[PDB]
């Protein structure tokens with residue numbers, strides 16, 4: 059069924075809350091035993107948001123391999139994403155270790171450091187060229203190379219150096235700075251523009267490791283970003299783009315990380331983004 063009219067059928071009936079609860083009811087439940095070990099309590103921002111054991115990213119160290127991060131592998135779309143929480147004061151070194159070990163080209167950030175007067179994640183990247191960051195616990199160095207500030211997002215070029223080998227890589231930081239403190243954007247125009255800028259960079263492409271995507275918990279805004287991208291890629295690839303069922307793509311993604319799309323408003327916004335993104339590509 060074409061999703062514009064279905065969209066219109068849910069909107070006219072006002073059943074967004076009822077669709078969203080059906081998804082929550084059918085979603086996968088797998089164990090998260092490593093996340094709940096007592097040694098890992100200060101590595102988790104939220105007690106109710108954990109990576110599943112089968113899909114968690116492992117750090118390449120013998121001490122403690124745990125980070126709150128999951129690999130979302132979409133087989134038919136041929137895309138992979140790492141979804142993770144906003145780094146904590148004691149996990150900033152782990153975060154950059156993961157970016158290095160997984161060979162990521164891009165980091166996508168969908169939140170501000172402060173929202174609603176509270177800290178949503180650590181200041182994990184340098185703000186001035188001449189004041190670089192060193193993480194002694196994971197032996198890495200991070201330098202701001204350049205910054206391009208626009209109205210809805212900022213793009214930064216960073217240099218990440220493995221102090222053990224003296225190898226360096228360029229990491230692109232894509233920071234969406236205008237998601238509102240409450241609710242979802244009114245138009246998906248600036249979110250779709252942002253997504254097309256990340257694609258243009260090469261960050262989502264198979265010649266690199268998976269892109270790292272985060273918000274505060276790494277399930278709501280982060281969920282919206284990977285659901286919209288995968289759905290539009292499938293519409294490009296299949297003979298009949300109407301076959302593409304956003305609710306079925308979301309349930310497949312929820313086999314890899316719990317809780318993706320946190321509210322009925324985020325579900326409606328996801329539909330809007332895919333429809334408009336489809337209409338802008340599919341002709342007019």
Ligand SMILES: NC(=O)NOCc1ccccc1
Pocket residue numbers: 146147148150180181182190191192193
């Ligand atoms: N140069 C340097 O040591 N920077 O500290 C990095 C850092 C640690 C914890 C939270 C945010 C940033």
Ligand SMILES: NC(=O)NOCc1ccccc1
Pocket residue numbers: 118119155158195196197198220221222
């Ligand atoms: N603590 C620890 O052993 N971390 O290993 C990760 C790491 C660090 C530097 C360069 C490459 C990998």
Ligand SMILES: NC(=O)NOCc1ccccc1
Pocket residue numbers: 294339340341
């Ligand atoms: N880009 C692309 O895949 N175009 O062909 C699909 C299409 C576009 C507009 C109207 C109907 C079908």
